[PDB]
Amino acid sequence: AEQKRQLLRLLAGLNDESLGMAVNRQSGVAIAQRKESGLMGLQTFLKATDDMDRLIFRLAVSFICEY
Amino acid sequence: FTKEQVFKIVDKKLGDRYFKDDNKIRPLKFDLILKSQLKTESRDEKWYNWNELLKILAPIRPD
């Protein structure tokens, strides 16, 4: 039970627990900044969210420039 | 890419530096070198290059 309880955090990409380090890595928003990379396991989810945000804002710009 | 297609994308200076032709981009064989880098937007890369160039050129030639 303890082994599968650790494997539950492992399988969801929550290994390399540096989320608290990663949010303090996103303090610099100065002019030209990258993602300032932390985790690797959840990056598929973040990338899918980024692509859906890009499609959402393309549609929103197409509505704003039209109405 | 036609000439008006090119001039809708790039700036006026970047278009005028290449077309002094025959209204077509004609690159030769031994003209370009492909260098891989991280995918970044052009203004951010130019901003970082401007920053390092102004931090390099400050002691050697201030004027």
Map the helices and strands.
This is part of a larger assembly, with two copies of chain A.
Chain A: H1 2-11, H2 19-24, H3 43-64
In words, what does this structure look like?
The structure is cut from a larger assembly and holds 2 copies of chain A. By secondary structure, the first copy, chain A, is mostly helical. Chain A has 3 helices and no strands. The first copy, chain A, has helices spanning 2-11, 19-24, 43-64. The longest helix of chain A is centred in the last third of the chain and has 22 residues, at 43-64. The radius of gyration of chain A is 17 Å and the shape is elongated. Chain A starts with a helix and ends with a helix. The PDB classes it as viral protein. Keywords: phage, phage tail, cryoem, virus, viral protein. Tail structure of Helicobacter pylori bacteriophage KHP30. Chains A, B are Portal protein. The organism of A, B is Helicobacter phage KHP30. It was solved by cryo-EM, 3.6 Å.
